[PDB]
Amino acid sequence: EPMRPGVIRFGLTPVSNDLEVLDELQAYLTQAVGQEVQLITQRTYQEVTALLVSGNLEAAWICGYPFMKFRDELDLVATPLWRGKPVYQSYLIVGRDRDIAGFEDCQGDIHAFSDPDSNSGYLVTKTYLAERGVSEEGFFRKSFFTYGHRNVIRAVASGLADSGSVDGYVWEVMKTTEPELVAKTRVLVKSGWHGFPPVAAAAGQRKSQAVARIRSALLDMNQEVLGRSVLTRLQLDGFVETTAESYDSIAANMERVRRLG
C-alpha cells in the first residue's frame, strides 16, 4: 500500500557555475534536514509542478504562477528574500542600442519568452498584450520559449530575438556575473512587484516530517556557513514564511489573461 521513495526529493528547474551551486544546495539540505536530499531538476515548470502535485517530490522551488494555478493541490513552504524583500519584477528587455521608446514599438518583433508557465518570462508580458487586445501570435512576427531566463538574455544579446521577457532578479544577478553579456541588453519596461518564486509542497504532505525539516532548513539557511554560501551564490538573503495572499497580484494577472482571452 504505501509508495514511498528511497530518499527526500527536492525539485527545481535549471539554475554559470550551476554544478557548484547545486552541489552545495544538495549538501546543505542534506546537512540541515538530517538525511539524504536528492535534487531533481526538470527542464520545464509544468514538469516540476506536476511531479510535485502528484506527490512525487517532497518539495520544489516553483514559480508563483504555477503555484497559484495549482493552489488547491499545493502549500507554500517558504519564499526567498532578494534585496531584503520577498518580491521581484519582470523586465522586458531589448538590445542595448535598439532605438525605441516603449513596448508598443516591439510590434513585429521576434520575442523570446522563458517558459509558458513563468510569471516573469511569459505571464506578465502576456498581460500587457491582453490588456491591449492582442496575443503573442498577433503582435509579434514570432515568439518562442527558451526554457531559461539566462537564455532569454542570450537570445536578445545575440540578436536572434529583438525583445525578451525575463526575471528581473535573474537579469540583475547576471549583470554582476556576466557583465559583458548583459551590457548587450537594456531594460525597456519593468513590471509591478510580484511574489518571489516560492518553495512549495503537496498539500497532503502539510505536516509531514520531511516538509517540516525542509521548511526549517530554508528558514535557518543563514545560520549555517554552507547555507550562507548557497545564498551568496544566488544573491539571495534568506527565506521567509508567506501565505498565498503574497501571490494575489499573480492570480489577478492570470485572471486578466483568462477574462480577456
Short mmCIF file of C-alpha atoms in Angstrom, two decimals:
data_model
loop_
_atom_site.label_atom_id
_atom_site.label_comp_id
_atom_site.label_asym_id
_atom_site.label_seq_id
_atom_site.Cartn_x
_atom_site.Cartn_y
_atom_site.Cartn_z
CA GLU A 1 0.00 0.00 0.00
CA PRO A 2 2.35 2.98 0.94
CA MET A 3 4.61 4.06 -2.08
CA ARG A 4 7.48 5.99 -0.55
CA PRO A 5 10.68 6.90 -2.47
CA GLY A 6 14.14 5.85 -1.28
CA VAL A 7 15.06 9.48 -0.27
CA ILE A 8 13.74 13.10 0.26
CA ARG A 9 13.38 14.66 -3.28
CA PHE A 10 13.54 18.41 -3.81
CA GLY A 11 12.54 19.57 -7.26
CA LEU A 12 13.70 22.60 -9.24
CA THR A 13 14.33 23.75 -12.83
CA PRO A 14 17.68 24.86 -14.18
CA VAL A 15 19.76 27.48 -12.29
CA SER A 16 27.02 29.90 -14.95
CA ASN A 17 28.66 27.65 -12.18
CA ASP A 18 25.36 25.75 -11.77
CA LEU A 19 27.04 22.43 -10.66
CA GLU A 20 28.87 24.17 -7.86
CA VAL A 21 25.63 25.82 -6.57
CA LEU A 22 23.59 22.63 -6.95
CA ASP A 23 26.15 20.53 -5.10
CA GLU A 24 26.24 22.99 -2.25
CA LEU A 25 22.47 23.26 -2.06
CA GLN A 26 22.13 19.47 -2.09
CA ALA A 27 24.78 19.15 0.64
CA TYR A 28 23.19 21.94 2.67
CA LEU A 29 19.74 20.49 2.55
CA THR A 30 21.15 17.07 3.44
CA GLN A 31 23.06 18.55 6.38
CA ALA A 32 20.06 20.50 7.62
CA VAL A 33 17.31 18.09 7.05
CA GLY A 34 19.14 15.30 8.70
CA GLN A 35 19.20 12.74 5.87
CA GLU A 36 19.87 12.48 2.18
CA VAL A 37 18.13 15.02 -0.03
CA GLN A 38 18.23 14.45 -3.80
CA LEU A 39 17.78 17.46 -6.12
CA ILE A 40 15.59 16.55 -9.07
CA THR A 41 15.89 19.03 -11.95
CA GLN A 42 13.44 19.08 -14.82
CA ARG A 43 13.56 21.31 -17.88
CA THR A 44 10.09 22.90 -17.57
CA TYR A 45 7.92 24.41 -14.91
CA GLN A 46 4.92 22.29 -15.72
CA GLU A 47 7.06 19.10 -15.36
CA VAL A 48 8.31 20.11 -11.89
CA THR A 49 4.92 21.25 -10.83
CA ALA A 50 3.14 18.06 -11.97
CA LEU A 51 5.71 15.87 -10.13
CA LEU A 52 5.06 17.90 -7.03
CA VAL A 53 1.29 17.88 -7.40
CA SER A 54 1.31 14.09 -7.77
CA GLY A 55 3.30 13.80 -4.55
CA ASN A 56 6.40 12.56 -6.41
CA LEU A 57 8.61 15.19 -4.80
CA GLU A 58 8.56 16.25 -1.17
CA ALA A 59 9.09 19.84 -2.13
CA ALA A 60 10.02 22.00 -5.11
CA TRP A 61 11.08 25.52 -5.95
CA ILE A 62 8.45 26.63 -8.47
CA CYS A 63 7.09 29.94 -9.83
CA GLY A 64 4.24 31.77 -8.24
CA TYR A 65 2.24 31.32 -11.42
CA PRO A 66 2.08 27.53 -11.35
CA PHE A 67 1.79 27.71 -7.59
CA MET A 68 -1.41 29.79 -7.94
CA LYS A 69 -2.67 27.66 -10.84
CA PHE A 70 -2.44 24.52 -8.58
CA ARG A 71 -3.18 26.37 -5.43
CA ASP A 72 -5.61 23.76 -4.01
CA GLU A 73 -3.14 20.92 -4.56
CA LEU A 74 -0.09 22.72 -3.03
CA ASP A 75 1.07 24.51 0.14
CA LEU A 76 3.71 27.21 0.45
CA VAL A 77 6.86 26.18 2.37
CA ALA A 78 8.86 29.42 2.22
CA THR A 79 9.69 32.33 -0.09
CA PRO A 80 13.12 33.71 -0.92
CA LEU A 81 14.22 37.15 0.03
CA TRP A 82 16.07 39.25 -2.51
CA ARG A 83 17.30 42.76 -1.80
CA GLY A 84 15.57 42.38 1.55
CA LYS A 85 12.06 41.61 0.30
CA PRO A 86 10.12 38.55 -0.99
CA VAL A 87 9.32 40.34 -4.31
CA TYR A 88 10.68 40.76 -7.83
CA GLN A 89 9.84 42.25 -11.25
CA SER A 90 9.63 41.14 -14.84
CA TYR A 91 11.95 43.08 -17.14
CA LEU A 92 11.03 43.45 -20.83
CA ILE A 93 14.50 43.68 -22.46
CA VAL A 94 15.79 44.80 -25.90
CA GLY A 95 19.23 45.18 -27.47
CA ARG A 96 21.49 47.85 -25.87
CA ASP A 97 21.40 50.15 -28.90
CA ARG A 98 17.90 49.49 -30.02
CA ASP A 99 16.28 52.89 -30.56
CA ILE A 100 12.69 52.51 -29.32
CA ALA A 101 10.57 54.33 -26.78
CA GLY A 102 8.25 51.70 -25.39
CA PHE A 103 6.58 48.33 -25.53
CA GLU A 104 4.27 49.29 -28.40
CA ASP A 105 7.26 49.61 -30.65
CA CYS A 106 8.02 45.88 -30.17
CA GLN A 107 5.09 45.07 -32.50
CA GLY A 108 6.50 42.76 -35.17
CA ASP A 109 9.46 41.59 -33.05
CA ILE A 110 10.85 38.17 -32.71
CA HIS A 111 10.28 37.74 -28.97
CA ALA A 112 11.86 35.36 -26.54
CA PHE A 113 9.79 34.09 -23.61
CA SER A 114 11.30 31.76 -20.92
CA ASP A 115 8.55 29.17 -20.18
CA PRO A 116 4.81 29.17 -20.75
CA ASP A 117 4.30 28.70 -17.07
CA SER A 118 6.70 31.54 -15.96
CA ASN A 119 5.31 34.57 -14.32
CA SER A 120 8.15 36.92 -15.37
CA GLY A 121 9.13 35.10 -18.54
CA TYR A 122 5.60 34.89 -20.02
CA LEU A 123 2.58 35.94 -17.90
CA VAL A 124 3.49 39.50 -17.20
CA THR A 125 4.10 40.25 -20.89
CA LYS A 126 1.03 38.15 -21.91
CA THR A 127 -0.90 40.55 -19.58
CA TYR A 128 0.47 43.63 -21.36
CA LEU A 129 -0.70 42.09 -24.70
CA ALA A 130 -4.15 41.00 -23.39
CA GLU A 131 -4.86 44.43 -21.91
CA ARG A 132 -4.34 45.82 -25.42
CA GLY A 133 -6.47 43.16 -27.10
CA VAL A 134 -3.68 41.15 -28.72
CA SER A 135 -1.90 37.89 -28.26
CA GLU A 136 1.71 36.99 -28.98
CA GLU A 137 0.74 35.46 -32.38
CA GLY A 138 -0.91 38.75 -33.44
CA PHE A 139 1.55 41.22 -32.02
CA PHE A 140 4.95 39.63 -32.69
CA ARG A 141 6.18 38.16 -36.01
CA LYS A 142 7.43 35.20 -34.00
CA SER A 143 7.74 34.17 -30.35
CA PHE A 144 9.47 31.18 -28.79
CA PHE A 145 10.34 29.67 -25.40
CA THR A 146 13.96 29.48 -24.34
CA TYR A 147 13.27 27.42 -21.18
CA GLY A 148 15.51 29.60 -19.06
CA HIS A 149 15.95 33.21 -18.10
CA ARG A 150 19.68 33.22 -18.86
CA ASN A 151 18.71 32.01 -22.34
CA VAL A 152 16.28 34.89 -22.86
CA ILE A 153 19.10 37.24 -22.17
CA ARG A 154 21.43 35.42 -24.52
CA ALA A 155 18.73 35.37 -27.28
CA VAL A 156 18.30 39.16 -27.09
CA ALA A 157 22.08 39.79 -26.70
CA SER A 158 22.85 37.72 -29.79
CA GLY A 159 20.12 39.38 -31.94
CA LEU A 160 18.10 36.23 -32.54
CA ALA A 161 15.30 37.91 -30.58
CA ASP A 162 14.54 41.60 -30.87
CA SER A 163 12.94 41.60 -27.36
CA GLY A 164 12.52 39.31 -24.44
CA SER A 165 10.71 38.73 -21.22
CA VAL A 166 12.95 37.94 -18.24
CA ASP A 167 13.04 37.57 -14.50
CA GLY A 168 14.46 40.90 -13.32
CA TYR A 169 16.21 39.13 -10.41
CA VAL A 170 17.98 36.98 -12.94
CA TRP A 171 18.90 39.90 -15.09
CA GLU A 172 20.36 41.79 -12.01
CA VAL A 173 22.38 38.72 -10.91
CA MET A 174 23.79 38.19 -14.38
CA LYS A 175 24.65 41.82 -14.70
CA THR A 176 27.22 41.10 -11.99
CA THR A 177 28.36 37.62 -13.07
CA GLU A 178 28.36 38.09 -16.91
CA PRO A 179 28.50 41.84 -17.35
CA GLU A 180 29.72 41.85 -20.96
CA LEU A 181 26.72 39.67 -21.96
CA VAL A 182 24.12 41.71 -20.07
CA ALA A 183 25.65 45.04 -21.42
CA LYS A 184 24.30 43.93 -24.83
CA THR A 185 20.78 44.33 -23.46
CA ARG A 186 18.78 47.03 -21.85
CA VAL A 187 15.59 47.15 -19.82
CA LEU A 188 12.75 48.67 -21.76
CA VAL A 189 9.85 48.11 -19.25
CA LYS A 190 9.85 46.98 -15.60
CA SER A 191 6.60 45.43 -14.31
CA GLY A 192 4.97 45.78 -10.94
CA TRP A 193 6.20 43.77 -7.95
CA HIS A 194 5.21 40.18 -7.62
CA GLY A 195 5.81 37.47 -5.09
CA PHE A 196 9.20 35.79 -5.48
CA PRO A 197 9.16 32.12 -6.78
CA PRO A 198 8.40 30.01 -3.68
CA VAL A 199 9.24 26.57 -2.41
CA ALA A 200 6.02 24.60 -2.21
CA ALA A 201 4.90 21.13 -1.05
CA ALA A 202 1.98 18.82 -1.99
CA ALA A 203 -1.00 19.83 0.17
CA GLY A 204 -1.18 16.19 1.53
CA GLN A 205 2.34 16.47 2.98
CA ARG A 206 1.44 19.57 5.03
CA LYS A 207 2.51 18.29 8.50
CA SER A 208 4.95 15.59 7.22
CA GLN A 209 8.35 15.38 8.80
CA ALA A 210 10.24 15.88 5.56
CA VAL A 211 8.25 19.09 4.89
CA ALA A 212 8.79 20.39 8.42
CA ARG A 213 12.51 19.74 8.21
CA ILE A 214 12.73 21.30 4.71
CA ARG A 215 10.99 24.36 5.94
CA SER A 216 13.31 24.82 8.89
CA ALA A 217 16.28 24.12 6.60
CA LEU A 218 15.18 27.06 4.40
CA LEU A 219 14.25 29.49 7.10
CA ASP A 220 17.54 28.75 9.01
CA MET A 221 19.77 28.68 5.94
CA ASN A 222 21.51 31.89 7.06
CA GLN A 223 22.59 30.34 10.32
CA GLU A 224 24.98 27.88 8.69
CA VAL A 225 28.15 28.53 6.75
CA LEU A 226 27.27 26.27 3.82
CA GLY A 227 23.74 27.70 3.76
CA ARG A 228 25.24 31.20 3.52
CA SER A 229 27.45 30.05 0.66
CA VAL A 230 24.39 28.95 -1.37
CA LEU A 231 22.59 32.28 -0.60
CA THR A 232 25.70 34.25 -1.62
CA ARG A 233 25.95 32.46 -4.97
CA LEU A 234 22.26 33.08 -5.68
CA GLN A 235 22.43 36.60 -4.27
CA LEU A 236 19.58 35.85 -2.01
CA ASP A 237 19.26 36.94 1.65
CA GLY A 238 17.29 34.03 3.10
CA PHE A 239 13.79 32.60 3.13
CA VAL A 240 10.65 33.74 4.88
CA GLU A 241 7.18 32.35 5.56
CA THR A 242 4.42 33.80 3.39
CA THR A 243 0.83 32.98 2.71
CA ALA A 244 -0.93 32.60 -0.65
CA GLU A 245 -2.03 36.21 -0.46
CA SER A 246 1.53 37.23 -1.33
CA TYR A 247 0.76 35.76 -4.79
CA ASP A 248 -2.51 37.68 -5.34
CA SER A 249 -1.02 40.04 -7.96
CA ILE A 250 -0.06 36.94 -10.00
CA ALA A 251 -3.55 35.40 -9.70
CA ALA A 252 -5.03 38.78 -10.77
CA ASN A 253 -2.91 38.73 -13.93
CA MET A 254 -3.86 35.15 -14.60
CA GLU A 255 -7.48 36.22 -14.47
CA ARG A 256 -6.99 39.26 -16.73
CA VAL A 257 -5.40 36.95 -19.30
CA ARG A 258 -8.34 34.48 -18.93
CA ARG A 259 -11.13 37.19 -18.73
CA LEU A 260 -9.71 38.90 -21.77
CA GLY A 261 -8.75 35.78 -23.75
#
